[PDB]
Amino acid sequence: VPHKSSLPEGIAPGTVLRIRGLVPPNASRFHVNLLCGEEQGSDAALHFNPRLDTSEVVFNSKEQGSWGREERGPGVPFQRGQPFEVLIIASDDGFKAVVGDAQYHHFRHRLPLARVRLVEVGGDVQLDSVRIF
Amino acid sequence: PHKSSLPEGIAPGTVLRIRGLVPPNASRFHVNLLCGEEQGSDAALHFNPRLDTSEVVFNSKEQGSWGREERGPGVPFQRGQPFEVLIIASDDGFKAVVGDAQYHHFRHRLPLARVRLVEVGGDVQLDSVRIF
């Protein structure tokens, strides 16, 4: 961490981002970002932000340097000291977040999916693997 | 064989996650995406790992007739060993992922929207089928 998977050909409907790792014992929060470029502060088609400290999972986007309106999933299917598996699945309509074996949240596209060019995973997380199919 | 009806209408972004164990004496097993619950319904995707000949056969079926086979490289399964398969529907075909790698891309031969059922059979101990 901070992880960085470049996506020069972008991502299309039917793309699966598979993220496996450990939330370490003193973790505050971590994030998975689908970014439109490599510059610092690049627009984000999806910002996925489990907050162990506040017991929420936040979803948002960023454009022109300005954040959108946050969406929240139900509860927090993550725990300090426990490993996790997250799927982020691109459809034509948005991103499906799967945590464990349960569909967790659907985030409607706000930026065109064709803008995505990079996946960034950072924060308080010890990554096992990041794979993009 | 195991059968699971599709829950929300297949589309680009539908992911089938299949977990299971290949028995020590396995010859082959298959995952079929079928267009109906009739026996004899078209198969938009037939995914057929062959432990015997160490290949993976891909095919479709239409009106009782099998299509052109796509026999891919090696078998990413082992007798006595567990597995996790993802079948991912995209606009252009089905991504078949096993373990940590996309094994093959099977271009759509039938309209994706005709798929209504997943079937899992052959020499396989099926742990779970999930549709996401």
Curated annotation (Swiss-Prot), chain B:
Keywords, comma-separated and alphabetical: Apoptosis, Cytoplasm, Lectin, Nucleus, Secreted
Induction info: By p53/TP53.
InterPro entries linked to this entry: ConA-like_dom_sf (IPR013320), Galectin-like (IPR044156), Galectin_CRD (IPR001079)
Domain Galectin stretches: 2-132
Binding annotation for a beta-D-galactoside: W66, G67, R68, E69, E70, R71, G72
Expression across tissues: Mainly expressed in stratified squamous epithelium.
Top-rank taxon, per record: Eukaryota
GO biological process terms, semicolon-separated: apoptotic process; heterophilic cell-cell adhesion via plasma membrane cell adhesion molecules
Predominant subcellular localization, coarse grouping: cytoplasm
One annotated Gene Ontology cellular component of this protein: nucleus
Name the UniProt record assigns to this protein: Galectin-7
